[PDB]
Amino acid sequence: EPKVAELKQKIEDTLCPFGFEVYPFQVAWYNELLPPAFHLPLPGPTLAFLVLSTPAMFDRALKPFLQSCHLRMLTDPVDQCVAYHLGRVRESLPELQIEIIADYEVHPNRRPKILAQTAAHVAGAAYYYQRQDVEADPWGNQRISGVCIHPRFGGWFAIRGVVLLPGIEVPDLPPRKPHDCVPTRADRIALLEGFNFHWRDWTYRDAVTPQERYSEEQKAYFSTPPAQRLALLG
């Protein structure tokens, strides 16, 4: 009966060379915090892995993918690339039943209504900073969206997927809280204001100083309209 550390290693062998990181969690840690509409429809002890992309994903996974025979038109290339690598995870664990979010062999709802930031938080991957994390906040009526912050990459990363392993239950998997790397009220205010009110501004992503950022080319790619992205960057 497979151990989490052995599975984690096999998934990392598959994904880490392509700029991803993977974090295990129990389905229960996620569901516990949410209304049933957003639950994962599985037994609490079920093992899951939260998958993130780091700044390296662009050079190691996306650019190669864009030059490959796998690329199709009419759907987002990043989504295609991610689905491809999550597909490779399935292949690398042929003896196991593996579900993936998002599953592109399912089209309608209900694909589950996953709240990705909450998954990243309970998996210890990135602290999900929300309005509630600022006491007596100054924003009144506005819609202040929260944002996850990675201790190594700040906001220079993205949550990309979840790998589920139904039938593999890890009731004694020990939880680890995400690193509270933006601990002070003033910094949390600056983070959330940068995120919700600052334009052509990547600055909220430095709320903790990152060790590495998206390259200028990657920044260009994500801030260029889709019609022009591939042409402009060749």
Side-chain angles (χ1 to χ4, degrees), residues 2 4-234:
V4 46
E6 302 160 8
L7 291 172
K8 179 163 185 295
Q9 180 68 31
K10 180 37 153 294
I11 295 166
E12 292 182 334
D13 286 340
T14 308
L15 298 181
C16 290
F18 296 95
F20 296 99
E21 283 181 359
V22 344
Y23 292 85
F25 66 107
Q26 285 190 43
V27 166
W29 306 344
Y30 170 88
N31 286 351
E32 277 174 8
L33 295 179
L34 302 169
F38 313 91
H39 285 198
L40 299 164
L42 286 167
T46 306
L47 175 60
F49 288 96
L50 188 277
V51 175
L52 310 180
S53 60
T54 73
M57 192 270 286
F58 185 80
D59 287 353
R60 293 198 212 155
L62 188 59
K63 270 164 56 170
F65 188 85
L66 290 173
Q67 292 176 284
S68 83
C69 61
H70 310 285
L71 178 68
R72 298 296 186 267
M73 295 195 66
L74 302 190
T75 77
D76 179 73
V78 170
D79 287 344
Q80 291 182 55
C81 178
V82 170
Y84 171 73
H85 287 290
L86 296 189
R88 292 178 51 248
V89 170
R90 250 201 204 107
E91 298 162 19
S92 78
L93 298 174
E95 305 307 303
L96 286 179
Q97 204 213 318
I98 297 172
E99 297 184 347
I100 293 170
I101 306 179
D103 188 355
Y104 289 75
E105 303 173 81
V106 195
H107 161 308
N109 42 34
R110 94 156 299 197
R111 299 206 312 213
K113 296 174 183 187
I114 183 64
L115 302 184
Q117 300 94 324
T118 295
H121 187 100
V122 308
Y127 200 106
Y128 179 25
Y129 290 100
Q130 302 183 75
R131 201 189 172 142
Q132 71 187 19
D133 296 310
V134 176
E135 194 180 26
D137 76 56
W139 301 303
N141 243 42
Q142 295 166 109
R143 298 196 234 173
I144 304 288
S145 289
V147 56
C148 285
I149 297 291
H150 188 290
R152 177 181 295 261
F153 301 112
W156 302 94
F157 78 107
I159 302 162
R160 291 305 184 183
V162 181
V163 174
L164 306 161
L165 296 100
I168 293 174
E169 302 193 9
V170 290
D172 306 317
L173 183 66
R176 189 182 190 180
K177 297 185 192 295
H179 189 175
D180 184 12
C181 47
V182 189
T184 74
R185 175 171 194 279
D187 285 350
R188 290 170 179 190
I189 284 180
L191 163 62
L192 290 176
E193 288 183 341
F195 190 61
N196 288 269
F197 306 130
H198 290 179
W199 296 54
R200 305 218 48 65
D201 200 348
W202 302 85
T203 288
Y204 82 84
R205 295 176 193 253
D206 288 343
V208 65
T209 301
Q211 291 191 34
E212 182 183 348
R213 295 184 175 85
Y214 291 178
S215 64
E216 294 304 316
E217 179 184 42
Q218 175 169 193
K219 286 164 70 190
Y221 181 92
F222 283 120
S223 56
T224 296
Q228 246 190 316
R229 276 178 188 175
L230 299 184
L232 259 190
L233 278 44

